[PDB]
Design a protein around this ligand. Structure first.
Ligand code: NAG
Ligand code: NAG
Lengths: 495, 75, 110, 75, 49, 49, 50, 75
């Protein structure tokens, strides 16, 4: 039950006729799935690893100029020549300097001048690319059983880790005692790694767009150059200075590491040491619960006394988790657990750790339940020695609805057109929504690519104004809606 | 330079903290604030030009803000 | 973030219940549930008897119970068998990311 | 960063050539052109917005120019 | 976590665009700027008269 | 001649001696002894507990 | 809120908005006060001395 | 000062007597009366201003009361 204690936990409720549910996993986020007769499970994408990265381009961020040579021509004789001028490891520039009798020419005019310095790279940033077939996502499936940690077991927790690769994208987790779960994942859509570069600078790495990386203004090698003697775009990292038209000097343009760090703002940082681990991905899977079963359903209710060994606490998600221990005769037994009113004549809350059972007597089991908004009483055990605990939930139903709508809108903003697959069970409405969102997201990405959030807000305000002052009601409402949507996206973007 | 193409708007944005997000969220707006503080003369002329260009009130403010944003960032 | 305080010695006749106190500060023991009790027999490495204030490892008897009140965490042994005679060290993961060990106590049992 | 606040408009300019005058004379315009090329979608939307917000051809053209120049710089 | 944010030499070079470079390896020599003078021709004689 | 230094700027730094302190929720802010010293760069944030 | 030998029961946001120098609850060295400027006055009366 | 912002309207008030409730229930009124007596000149100006910005007897009286209450209060 790892998904408690994380603020991004999200609840998927229900499966389809086929016993499957579509869930989108994310690295920061966590998913808790609850089905009628299936146990509650916690799914988290922990590791995304890109393997066998190939370098496509090396950029120079700190250059050096060493052997400066110059050649001068007298006026009306054209441009001079240097043999270093057609050497590719030399950066050269042609200019004009005043010439005359003092200079040694004999004619009065502009004399051509050329200066060359050898370009040497002292530090570079490797932009690597990974084939989409080499992504290996790692997921952990932990059955939300309530069992505590076991030292003797080879696996201390009963969470099972399953690796999903693009070729072997179908895998089943065998949760001991709970049957098995099958993940039908789609790695090829999680991230488009044919438009991404794994940009590793000195000791740090980022996941960046590939056209952005190919359009950087720095000297670059093609990536297969071991010698590094043919830098391209060398003039972006040097400056040629000709003041007063008397001399010409060329100097290096300074370590560009800080400028690159400033240019990397808005790029997610990813580890690129001891493997290419990305902790920013999302993965879409189809969860099949048909072979997943509740543990201990053929047990009898416990008749003994329970003591709380860990005081009831409220998680960030509006549920409560308590830890109880058993002092009764029936070794394995179902724990009687209800959330009722003060008079115990109505059931107000629903359990999250479905089928809490007590496998071993001297082994506490911790139960997550969702009490109702307001006052409620957690009853644990049967009448002789029964323990009744009060609790107050400080929210409101309208508040929770607003928070849920905000969370849905936020996931739409993050996983645009893929949020429809976060809790979908099939269905016509889900497919229609996903198709319309795909079309509109294509249009939005076309019309808002490479634009900052302030520009997004400005455009949203302009569009909303245009809609507000519109003669036609249909266009007015459509434009006002577009403006509101782009205002929200600009507010929520760049995180 | 390379710092003038910051990779801010290239999509690809997850629910994970990107590089220099909190720092770099308002840094451009703060730059514009400092520039307008240091160069109030241009702002007055930009306001006059915006007022004289465009008839509707909305038009004038749109022009004024656009000019004051371009000025410092024209580099 | 300094050494936790425990009585130098504790004794209890077999079959009695024996209690050990570990007193920390608002960061050592009163701030976090990183309270673990270690049992070390002479000439041997310490054994983790309790953790998370109350929890005990899989192989640890049920006679060991832990409680925490304010800045003080207590360890209580019920059966108090002869094999329970050892040095009991209390530890806590402090707020600064370090580990502090109590001075330790000794059970004489007889 | 520091690179975002250059020394170009200071008014201390003599006849002597400055630090990167030759290089940086057209860098900003080149960068705007490259941005428009890479991100064509925003250009069309900006053209439509300028046309809608401007009553006259002068207002439309000026607004479109300002929008196009601000979008890359604003990033 | 906290990171150091690299070296700002190149960004500073980009920022210094529009500034006239000078010399400081010895004496802070400046090779830019003007000077306004008045000429006193009164005591100037032609050399070969 | 004899120009007096006006301001020194850092263009390349290095961070070291990193340290972290945490508090449980609703218990205010943690305290680091290094916060007293002004050569330590410090920041306060909240993490799920 | 307990002051010298007397205690009160106060609102939390009111207490955290108090304009006094403060330490965090776990400060443990006792010397890094936050808004010390609320409890001192700097005087430069004639722009002659401070 | 801490004294400038008291713990007055916080919704924590029980049947049990609050700190300095009895004495402090009328301190503001006493201070306002003393200030008005000490500075009769300002009250005349406040009355004239309230009458000038009127258009209803209720409006003028409320304006004068608010001005006289906040004149001593704003330090
Ligand atoms: C560049 O200068 C270095 C100085 O030691 C010299 O060793 C090297 O041979 C030179 N390379 C040329 C002139 O190509
Ligand atoms: C910082 O760490 C170094 C070891 O790299 C140590 O020598 C130094 O004393 C430490 N200083 C502080 C203030 O922690």
């Amino acid at each position: 039950m790892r998904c408690i204690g994380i603020s991004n936990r999200d609840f998927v409720e229900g499966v389809s006729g086929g016993s499957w549910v579509d869930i989108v996993l994310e690295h920061g986020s966590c998913v808790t799935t609850m089905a009628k007769n299936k146990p509650t499970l916690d799914f988290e994408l922990i590791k995304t690893e890109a393997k066998h990265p190939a370098t496509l381009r090396k950029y120079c961020i700190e250059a050096k100029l060493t052997n400066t040579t110059t050649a001068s021509r007298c006026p009306t004789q054209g441009e001079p020549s240097l043999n270093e001028e057609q050497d590719k490891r030399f950066v050269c520039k042609h200019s004009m300097v005043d010439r005359g009798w003092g200079n040694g020419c004999g004619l009065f005019g502009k004399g051509g001048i050329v200066t060359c310095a050898m370009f040497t790279c002292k530090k570079n940033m490797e932009g690597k690319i990974v084939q989409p077939e080499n992504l290996e996502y790692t997921i952990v499936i932990t059955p939300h059983s309530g069992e505590e940690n076991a030292v003797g077991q080879d696996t201390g927790k009963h969470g099972k880790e399953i690796k999903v690769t693009p070729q072997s994208s179908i895998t089943e987790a065998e949760l001991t005692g709970y049957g098995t779960v099958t993940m039908e994942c789609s790695p090829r859509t999680g991230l488009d790694f044919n438009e991404m570069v794994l940009l590793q600078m000195e000791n740090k790495a980022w996941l960046v767009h590939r056209q952005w990386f190919l359009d950087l203004p720095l000297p670059w090698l093609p990536g297969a150059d071991t010698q590094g003697s043919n830098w391209i775009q060398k003039e972006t990292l040097v400056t040629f200075k000709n003041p007063h038209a008397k001399k010409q000097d060329v100097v290096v343009l300074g370590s560009q590491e800080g400028a690159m760090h400033t240019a990397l703002t808005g790029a997610t940082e990813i580890q690129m040491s001891s493997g290419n681990l990305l902790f920013t991905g999302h993965l879409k899977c189809r969860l099949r619960m048909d072979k997943l079963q509740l543990k201990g359903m053929s047990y009898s209710m416990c008749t003994g006394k329970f003591k709380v060994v860990k005081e009831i606490a409220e998680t960030q998600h509006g549920t409560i988790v308590i830890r109880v221990q058993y002092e009764g005769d029936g070794s394995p037994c179902k724990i009687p657990f209800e959330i009722m009113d003060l008079e115990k004549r109505h059931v107000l809350g629903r359990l999250i750790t479905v089928n809490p059972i007590v496998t071993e007597k001297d082994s506490p089991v911790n139960i997550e339940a969702e009490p109702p908004f307001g006052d409620s009483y957690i009853i644990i055990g049967v009448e002789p020695g029964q323990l009744k605990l009060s609790w107050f939930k400080k929210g409101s139903s309208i508040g929770q609805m607003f928070e849920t709508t905000m969370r849905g809108a936020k996931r739409m903003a993050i996983l645009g057109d893929t949020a429809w697959d976060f809790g979908s069970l099939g269905g016509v409405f889900t497919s229609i929504g996903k198709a319309l969102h795909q079309v509109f997201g294509a249009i939005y990405g076309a019309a808002f690519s490479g634009v900052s959030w302030t520009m997004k807000i400005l455009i949203g305000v302009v569009i909303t104004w245009i809609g507000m002052n519109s003669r036609s009601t249909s266009l007015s409402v459509s434009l006002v809606l577009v403006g509101v949507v782009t205002l929200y996206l600009g507010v929520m973007v760049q995180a | 330079s390379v710092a003038l193409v910051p990779h801010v708007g290239m999509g690809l944005e997850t629910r994970t903290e990107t590089w220099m997000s909190s720092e770099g969220a308002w840094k451009h707006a703060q730059r514009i604030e400092t520039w307008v503080l240091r160069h109030p003369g241009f702002t007055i002329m930009a306001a006059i030009l915006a007022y004289t260009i465009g008839t509707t009130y909305f038009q004038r403010v749109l022009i004024f803000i656009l000019l004051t944003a371009v000025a410092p960032s024209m580099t | 973030q300094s050494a936790l305080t425990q009585p130098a010695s504790v004794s209890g006749s077999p079959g009695q219940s024996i209690t050990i106190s570990c007193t920390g500060t608002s960061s050592d023991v009163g701030g976090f549930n990183y309270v673990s009790w270690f049992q070390q027999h002479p000439g041997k490495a310490p054994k983790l008897m309790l953790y998370d204030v109350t929890s005990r490892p899989s192989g640890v008897s049920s006679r060991f119970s832990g409680s925490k009140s304010g800045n003080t965490a207590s360890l209580t042994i019920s059966g108090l068998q002869a094999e329970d005679e050892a040095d009991y060290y209390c530890s806590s993961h402090t707020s600064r990311g370090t580990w502090v060990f109590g001075g330790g106590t000794k059970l004489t049992v007889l």
